[PDB]
């Protein structure tokens, strides 16, 4: 159905009314989202059907219709924008300077912004509008606030 590039809401009709469970990025005919949003299940776009193509629970990512297409990376210095798509609310750009997640396997960027769980999968962008990762997998710190990793996949 709808294959236009852009940001999309991932909805369900299983719970009360219509519920937004996450968000995704359509790019080069491929739908990219977080694994915990869909759990690998098939998606619908009007009459069209999107089937999972690649996914990994540890990276918390999943692609539909083709391999992962997003490869831009945070430069480690510049401010970025979270294109937040909250449930029942309009898409909104929020600019912030990322922090760092230090892990035994290396450093990852981190965006310290609080949004409902249904915002998971919203893209993080660089100054050229390129998707450097998805927001929606992270940690809750001391004051009860949320810090998301800048989760990016590997392009083949």
């Amino acid at each position: 159905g709808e294959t236009t590039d852009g940001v999309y809401r991932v909805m369900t009709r299983r719970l009360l009314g219509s519920t937004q469970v996450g968000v995704g990025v359509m790019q080069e005919g491929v739908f990219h989202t977080m694994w915990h949003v869909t759990k690998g299940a098939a998606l619908r776009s009007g009459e069209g059907r999107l089937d999972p193509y690649w996914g990994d629970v540890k990276q918390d990512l999943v692609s539909y219709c083709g391999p992962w297409k997003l490869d831009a990376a945070w430069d480690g210095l510049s401010e970025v924008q979270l294109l937040a798509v909250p449930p029942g609310e309009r898409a909104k750009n929020i600019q912030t300077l990322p922090g760092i997640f230090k892990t035994k396997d290396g450093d990852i960027g981190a965006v310290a912004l609080d949004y409902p769980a249904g915002t998971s999968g919203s893209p993080i962008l660089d100054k050229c509008g390129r998707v450097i990762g998805l927001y929606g997998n992270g940690v809750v710190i001391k004051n009860g606030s949320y810090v998301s990793a800048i989760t990016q996949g590997k392009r083949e």
Binding site: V7, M11, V23, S45, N93, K127
Partner: protein, 39 residues
């Protein structure tokens, strides 16, 4: 069944709301894809 709905273009907005801090955190990632704070 899950479905998708378009919500907008992917573009950088000049003069967007600037907010949020930049913490340096020690974290661990388990096999289930869950991050946790290491202290």
């Amino acid at each position: 069944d899950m479905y998708i709905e378009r919500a907008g273009d992917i573009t950088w907005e000049k003069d967007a709301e600037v907010t949020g801090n930049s913490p340096r955190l020690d974290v661990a990632l388990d096999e289930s894809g869950d991050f946790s704070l290491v202290e």
